[PDB]
């Protein structure tokens, strides 16, 4: 998408669940939506699945109803390979170059890319120091009090004086 | 010494036996750390599921107790034909016909064995029923007319497990904000005119929908039913309803799940009220009528299988995996085999095909020579006619 030349073996590096559990289907669904914002940070691969599962659980949890239905469509047609138009233009290119080539046949081109918010996803170490802005686009009206649970001294100690 | 006999000869014996007809399960993946057997069960919505594999205490004449010590003779005191030192004994390749024919004999003994029970269950497959109040919401409603409803406990006892068998999304809770259109989408998703009540109060159009479309509301209780509806007519009343039975056949209508032929319907309508002992007596009678002496191998197998107690409740039974956690999983394409999705009453395909013709015979008017009712009247019988 950044326009760089890429030497990768195949235009899409995602797997297609030919036969899978429900969780694999939801993973494959959220993998074609490309929710993540670009990041240069190191990630912990060991828990990657969990992250991608949690991301999925949130993505569907607060997407607009049409995006929700789109996610559901992908989730049900897990055998189909969803992809952006430009991906398919790349496949057409490589087919016209080498007609004998075998590509996964069951594909669906997105006529329009989803407009979902990009998700920050730095799963590496370090706390975030948010600078809360005074105002934003969202308007609130009688929001319920958000109780904060007690935390252990193991997580955070509170000395009197820096 | 024995290694060549194992790796090079016995291995092929294993590879053949794995292909024998009745060796039907997957036994071991070769990885001890992770392997567990898939655990199917036969599962009645009525009775308890019966796992195919369990510690049921049947030693099978001591076969289930494993002596490991057997390895000692296999190593230190057994001969093998591959281990010659060299006589060169010729390898034996056993006739397929023997194991094949005994496998077939077993299979045919089994189908013939289950047949009468499968038949009676196919007939009574629609016969389970929930209690159903029908509140009247109009000035001139007949007792059958109104808003059908049932207790949630009935829904658990009968409707829910069958919905799990039919593999459809659970029926929507209705909150009184619900449109008749939402209700319609639910019913058309579950193929069953059922919705669960949640919070008051159901609105006018939704109630007219439930009435006109005979949707069955599932109330948690009947504590104050009329409070739950916004009855503009005020024709509804807590004391005005008709309690009545609702057959499952009158809810569900799946072709290989719940027999709902009007033939079978009227045939059941002819039946006297039935206990489980009555049904069992029927199966035993049919079996007594249609028992035929088996090939001698089959008699040996039935003798080996022990008494045919058949405690399992086979009504509407399906084959489903359970979680090791104990919950019964819905049938899943991409894991369970297609044969398992519907038991088809545990009848053969041809038997169903014939069964349809038979139903055409059984409801033929010419056969229907059992007559109901007589008119006592004192009259001269000049020129008699039977008719």
């Amino acid at each position: 998408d950044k326009g760089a030349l890429v030497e990768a073996d195949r235009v899409i590096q995602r797997l297609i669940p030919l036969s899978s559990s429900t969780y694999v289907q939801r993973l494959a669904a959220i993998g074609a939506l490309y929710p993540n914002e670009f990041t240069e940070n190191v990630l912990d691969l060991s828990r990657l699945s969990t992250a991608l599962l949690q991301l999925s659980d949130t993505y569907y949890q607060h997407a607009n109803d049409q995006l929700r239905r789109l996610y559901r469509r992908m989730y049900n047609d897990s055998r189909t390979l969803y992809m952006t138009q430009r991906h398919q233009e790349l496949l057409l290119a490589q087919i016209t170059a080498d007609p004998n080539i075998l590509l996964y046949p069951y594909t669906y081109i997105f006529t329009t890319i989803p407009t979902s918010m990009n998700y920050i996803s730095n799963t590496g170490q370090g706390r975030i120091k948010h600078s809360l802005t005074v105002t934003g686009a969202t308007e609130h009206d009688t929001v319920a009090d958000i109780v904060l649970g007690q935390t252990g001294e193991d997580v955070i100690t509170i000395s009197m004086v820096e | 010494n024995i290694a060549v006999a194992h790796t090079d000869h016995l291995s092929v014996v294993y590879a053949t036996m794995s292909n024998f007809m009745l060796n039907f399960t997957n036994n071991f993946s070769g990885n001890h750390a992770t392997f567990k057997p898939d655990q199917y069960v036969i599962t009645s919505p009525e009775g308890s599921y019966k796992p195919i594999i369990e510690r049921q205490g049947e030693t099978v004449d001591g076969l289930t107790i494993i002596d490991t010590s057997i390895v000692w003779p296999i190593l230190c005191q057994c001969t093998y034909p591959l281990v010659r030192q060299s006589i060169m004994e010729e390898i034996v390749y056993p006739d397929p016909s023997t194991t094949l024919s005994q496998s077939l004999s077993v299979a045919q003994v089994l189908s013939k064995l289950t047949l009468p029970d499968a038949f009676i269950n196919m007939i009574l497959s629609g016969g389970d029923s929930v209690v159903m109040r029908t509140y009247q919401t109009e000035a001139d409603d007949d007792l059958d007319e109104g808003i059908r409803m049932t207790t949630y406990d009935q829904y658990l006892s009968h409707i829910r497990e069958r919905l799990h068998i039919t593999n459809v999304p659970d029926p929507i809770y209705i909150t009184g904000a619900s449109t008749p259109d939402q209700i319609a989408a639910s019913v058309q998703a579950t193929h069953v005119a059922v919705v669960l009540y949640q919070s008051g109060v159901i609105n006018g159009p939704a109630s007219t929908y439930l009435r006109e479309n005979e949707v069955l509301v599932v109330m948690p209780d009947y504590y104050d039913v009329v409070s739950r509806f916004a009855n503009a007519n005020l024709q509804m009343n807590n004391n005005r309803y008709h309690e009545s039975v609702l057959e499952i056949a009158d809810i569900f209508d799946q072709a290989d799940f719940i027999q709902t032929s009007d033939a079978v319907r009227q045939l059941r309508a002819l039946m006297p009220t039935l206990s489980t002992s009555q049904i069992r007596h029927a199966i035993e009678r049919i079996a007594q009528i249609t028992d035929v002496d088996s090939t001698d191998y089959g008699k040996l197998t039935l003798r080996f299988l022990g008494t045919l107690t058949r405690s399992l409740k086979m009504q509407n039974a399906q084959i489903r995996r359970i979680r090791p956690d104990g919950t019964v999983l819905r049938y899943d394409d991409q894991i369970d085999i297609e044969a398992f999705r519907w038991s088809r009453y545990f009848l053969d395909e041809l038997q169903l095909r014939r069964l349809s013709v038979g139903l055409r015979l059984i409801t033929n008017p010419r056969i229907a020579r059992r007559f109901n009712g007589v008119r006592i009247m004192y009259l001269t019988d000049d020129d008699p006619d039977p008719d």
Binding site: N76 | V187, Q188, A193, N213, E214, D256, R353, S356
Partner: protein, 292 residues
């Protein structure tokens, strides 16, 4: 020889296609009016159907008169057909493919190796145009020539369920068919269709051209759609009934989606894998001819 009319052979009353319905011989079109649809969130997008292979499988040296119509209809519609590619007699259509062959395709649906007395048959030219495509049923199972059995069903749905707008778009929601039904409806529909003299339909589909072919394609669209309906019920993932106030609505979900099921069921006919390969090939050829 029965000469083909200026219209198709289907214009002749001898080849009326009708399904029994409400105690009458209903035309298929007036059955399809009973059909109704419930869109799901899911979508069918029709892809281009790959061009059928040029290769006509060689007719084997077969002494006998093959009953081709029976084989084809039973493969597409038969309640009990199985292993339809093992016997391999569809290749026989290729015998009719030759110019000036001694073979005749009888109205019986049999493939006589020689013209024989008191057996009426289709005009050999039209049959040649027909066989030149449909002999390729004879390689429905050979691996190099197997049709896609997944994507093609989209077209089925489009030609069946599709509204004129959805058909122009080339995409439609995956729908779920439904109609008020008598007991054993789909089985009876399938048997009423297996009795059809569909060779008339295919012969006219392959032989006609220009205005005649177009008029054929409109006059016979509902016939084709009935065949598509039987076929789709054979591949529908499930087929439920619904109570609807002392009426029963048969419902097959879903149109245009081959579930690849091979387990039998009482409700409808079932495709074994071979029947799937055959139906896939048939739909490839027939949809190819249907668009031109």
């Amino acid at each position: 020889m029965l000469q083909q009319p200026t219209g198709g052979y289907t214009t002749l009353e001898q080849f009326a296609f009708t399904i029994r319905n409400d105690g009458t011989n209903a035309t298929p079109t007036q059955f399809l009016q009973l059909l109704s649809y419930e869109a799901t969130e899911n979508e069918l997008v029709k892809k281009t159907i790959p061009t059928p292979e040029t290769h006509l499988p060689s007719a084997r040296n077969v002494p006998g008169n093959v009953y081709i119509e029976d084989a084809i209809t039973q493969a597409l519609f038969g309640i009990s057909a199985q292993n339809v590619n093992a016997h391999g007699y569809f290749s026989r259509l290729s015998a009719l493919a030759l110019p000036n062959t001694s073979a005749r395709l009888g109205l019986d649906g049999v493939i006589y190796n020689s013209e024989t007395i008191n057996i009426p048959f289709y005009d050999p030219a039209a049959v040649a145009n027909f066989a030149a495509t449909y002999a390729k049923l004879g390689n429905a199972s050979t691996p190099r020539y197997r049709a896609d059995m997944i994507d093609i069903y989209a077209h089925v749905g489009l030609e069946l369920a599709g509204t004129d707008a959805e058909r122009a778009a080339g995409v439609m929601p995956v729908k779920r068919a439904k109609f008020d039904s008598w007991e054993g409806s789909l089985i009876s529909l399938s048997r009423d269709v297996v009795n059809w003299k569909i060779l008339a339909f295919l012969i006219d589909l392959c032989s006609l051209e220009g205005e005649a072919l177009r008029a054929f394609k409109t006059r016979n669209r509902d016939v084709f759609r009935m065949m598509l309906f039987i076929m789709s019920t054979a591949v529908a993932a499930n087929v439920v009934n619904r109570k609807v106030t002392k009426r029963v609505d048969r419902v097959l979900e879903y149109i245009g989606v081959n579930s690849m099921r091979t387990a039998g069921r009482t409700a409808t006919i079932t495709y074994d894998l071979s029947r799937h390969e055959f139906a896939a090939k048939f739909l490839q050829l027939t949809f190819t001819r249907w668009n031109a």
